[PDB]
């Protein structure tokens, strides 16, 4: 398909089955379907904890660097994943969501104490 | 096979019972002002907007009286043909308003309506209409009704007689007051909870909404998602609508509601019962179809045993055809099951078999379709459409295939055309008469 415009993006294509999300990190042309063609698969992400209580994430760091150099964008979930991995700085929204959770927890703690 | 049918719930307890609005069916003789009276009560003028000025459909309307009460008026066809429609209206009615023209007095259809009212065991209110015109003799009307057992109050008869003039809208207020009084005396109530019970008043196929049935609720509230079963058909209620087409959230008892989502078109007058779920509804439908199949199988076994005994008698002792000119094959297409049934009853009244046979190849509800044209071609028949459309493509195909599609909008016009065709097939004018 002769795609008018568009650009590469490193994003999480969703696979798995119902109630069992699983992600393939794909450097795919942004306009292509989420589960459609992709230039290269750069790793994986299992959101459901395994028996060891781990959320396995595979990152082909060399290829991710290559595609960032070639100009691929980064979807927000992938940016957050890289921030967690430490490959990138913690996302501002990761930090701000942590702060919001702390404030909500403090409010609920105050409510619980006032009982 | 275990009996998995769905059966009307037993009469509700007085604690469950709750006041419900009355259903009044306006019945009478042709052109005696039933629809005009209904128009006056509804505050809307439809008598002018009619094909042939004839009511050919048992129509329901939820009128609201100025006092604030609500009444479900069923305006029924007055012609001789629609006996089944009149009987069904009498069955579903709580009260029967018999409209009799003061000018013309009692008539054959008036007597038929009185008989149906007696059979349904429903109170009768006489509305003597056309009182304005000279020779209007309500006293004569009452005296003649004495013969048919509709005794007025003046003669010590429980039936209330009301002189009205639907044309001038005079005395209709007192007619409505009498209707309200009779409803109060009847003290109509029904359970507004639990599985729904209703009656199909009409069925049809709408090109946008599917198989649509105009029903009247009898017990419990109907809502989107309820699973209904009626006769051999079932639905998951997809859209409930009113006479105006406005979607309505709930259908309380004695309300006329058009229901969509029927997987098959039910027959007019059949009972609608709510069931638990789709699998249960399909089980009920399969059981009912199986029962009908067993009945038909018993009858077919009788016929087949006749044939086999004949053949065995024949044997033990020893030890395509071109259709005649005097055979009119007809396809029948109606806008509603009621019209289809009326035409079929008219056909079944046929008695001129010797001179020319009248074969009913197929009948249905909806626009003349390619399959109808194919049947007509296969049997050199004629398609008769009652208030249905014949698209341009269908017309072209019928012209190519030599079929004759005859659309009509009046029952007696269609019957005149049918008798014309029978006479044409004859070797002269036909001897069968519709009435």
């Amino acid at each position: 398909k002769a795609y008018r415009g568009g650009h590469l993006t490193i994003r999480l294509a969703l696979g798995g089955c119902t109630n069992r999300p699983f992600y393939r990190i794909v450097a795919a042309h942004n306009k292509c379907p989420r589960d459609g063609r992709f230039v290269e698969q750069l790793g994986s992400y299992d959101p459901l904890p395994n028996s060891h209580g781990e959320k396995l994430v595979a990152l082909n760091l060399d290829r991710i660097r290559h595609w960032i150099g070639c100009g691929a964008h980064l979807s927000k979930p992938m940016e957050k994943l890289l921030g967690l991995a430490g490959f990138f700085p913690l996302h501002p929204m990761m930090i701000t969501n942590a702060e919001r959770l702390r404030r909500k927890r403090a409010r609920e703690v105050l409510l619980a104490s006032q009982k | 096979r275990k009996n998995k049918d769905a059966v009307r719930r037993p009469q509700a307890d007085p604690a469950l019972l709750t006041p419900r609005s009355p259903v009044v069916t306006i019945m009478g003789h042709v052109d005696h002002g039933k629809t005009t009276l209904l128009d006056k009560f509804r505050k809307t003028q439809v008598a002018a907007v009619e094909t042939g000025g004839i009511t050919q459909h048992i129509g329901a309307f939820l009128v609201s009286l100025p006092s604030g009460e609500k009444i479900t008026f069923l305006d029924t066809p007055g012609h001789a043909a629609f006996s089944a429609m009149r009987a069904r209206g009498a069955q579903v009615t709580d009260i029967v308003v018999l409209v009799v023209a003061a000018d013309d007095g009692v008539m054959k259809q008036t007597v038929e309506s009185i008989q149906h009212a007696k059979d349904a065991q429903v109170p009768i209110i006489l509305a003597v209409n056309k009182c304005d015109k000279a020779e209007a003799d309500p006293e004569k009307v009452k005296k003649e009704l004495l013969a048919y057992d509709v005794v007025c109050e003046d003669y010590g008869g429980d039936v209330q007689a009301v002189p009205v003039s639907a044309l001038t809208g005079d005395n209709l207020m007192a007619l409505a007051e009498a209707t309200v009084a009779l409803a109060e005396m009847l003290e109509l109530k029904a359970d507004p909870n639990g599985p729904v019970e209703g009656t199909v008043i009409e069925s049809f196929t709408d090109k946008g909404r599917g198989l649509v049935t105009t029903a009247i609720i009898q017990r419990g509230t109907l809502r989107k998602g309820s699973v209904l079963v009626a006769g051999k058909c079932w639905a998951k209620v997809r859209l409930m609508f009113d006479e105006n087409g406005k979607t309505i959230d709930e259908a309380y008892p004695s309300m006329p509601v058009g229901i969509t989502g029927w997987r098959d078109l039910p027959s007019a007058g059949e009972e609608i019962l709510e069931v638990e779920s789709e699998p249960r509804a399909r089980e009920v439908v399969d059981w009912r179809k199986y029962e009908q199949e067993q009945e038909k199988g018993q009858e077919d076994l009788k016929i087949i045993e006749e044939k086999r005994k004949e053949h065995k008698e024949a044997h033990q002792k020893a030890r395509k055809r071109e259709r005649d000119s005097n055979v009119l094959s007809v396809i029948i297409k109606g806008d509603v099951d009621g019209s289809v049934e009326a035409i079929l009853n008219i056909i079944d009244t046929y008695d001129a078999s010797h001179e020319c046979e009248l074969e009913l190849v197929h009948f249905g509800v909806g626009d003349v379709s390619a399959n109808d044209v194919n049947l007509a071609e296969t049997f050199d028949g004629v398609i008769y459409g009652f208030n249905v459309n014949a698209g341009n493509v269908i017309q072209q195909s019928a012209a190519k295939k030599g079929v004759k599609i005859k659309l009509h909008k009046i029952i007696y016009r269609l019957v005149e055309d049918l008798q014309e065709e029978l006479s044409s097939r004859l070797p002269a004018k036909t001897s069968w008469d519709p009435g």
Binding site: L61, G83, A85, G86, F87, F88, P89 | -
Partner: protein, 212 residues
């Protein structure tokens, strides 16, 4: 494979291009507005809620320049949004104007000027973006020097920042594997990455145009 011309397709493409060019809508038509419904009549599209007060209160660049000789060429114009956002002076030094004469009051068109943002000028004059916007204000001839008075703060710009933890570890491990004995901290340079606020005017010359 023997081709079959798409002659009607090409002809229609050409005719559509010609029609668009010859019926090109005027700027006064494109950027018109209704001050009751707050919708551009030409397209019928509503303006964002956050622009309603500005549309109802402040004025457009050409709507102002219509009252200035030579359209105030050489004057200094500033935007209400800039005034509310930055304490430092920000303005355009008007250098050229191409009004939309078709406009009733010549209250639309294009402008070119030299940008001063955060007290920093721009080397060359370029087109003014957001001319049609409703957040423009005019700098009176007097008070001009006082308003443009400004002295730069010390040039606060970090030379380098720590690498993300995993990247730092990877670089350190690569150095050790190569055998480098350096204990120097690896720092990612940020001087070349000159951050520029989001409200910094964009290159209008490359901006597109509406259609209808």
């Amino acid at each position: 494979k023997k081709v079959r011309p798409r002659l009607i397709a090409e002809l229609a493409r050409r005719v559509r291009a010609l029609r668009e060019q010859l019926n090109r809508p005027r700027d006064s038509q494109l950027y018109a507005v209704d001050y009751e419904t707050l919708t551009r009549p030409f397209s019928g599209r509503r303006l964002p809620v956050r622009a309603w007060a500005d549309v109802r209160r402040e004025s457009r660049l050409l709507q102002l320049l219509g009252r200035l000789p030579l359209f105030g060429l050489g004057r200094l114009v500033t935007r209400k949004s800039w005034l509310w956002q930055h304490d430092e002076p920000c303005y355009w030094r008007l250098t050229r104007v191409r009004p939309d004469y078709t406009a009733q009051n010549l209250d639309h068109g294009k402008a070119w000027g030299i940008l001063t943002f955060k007290g920093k000028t721009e080397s060359e004059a370029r087109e003014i973006e957001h001319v049609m916007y409703h957040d423009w204000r005019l700098v009176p001839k007097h008070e001009e020097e006082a308003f443009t008075a400004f002295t730069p703060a010390p040039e606060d710009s970090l030379a380098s920042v720590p690498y993300p933890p995993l990247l730092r570890a990877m670089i350190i491990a690569e150095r050790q594997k190569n055998g480098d004995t350096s204990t120097e901290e690896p720092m990612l340079n940020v001087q070349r990455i000159r951050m520029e606020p989001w409200d910094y005017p964009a290159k209008q010359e490359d901006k597109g145009r509406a259609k209808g």
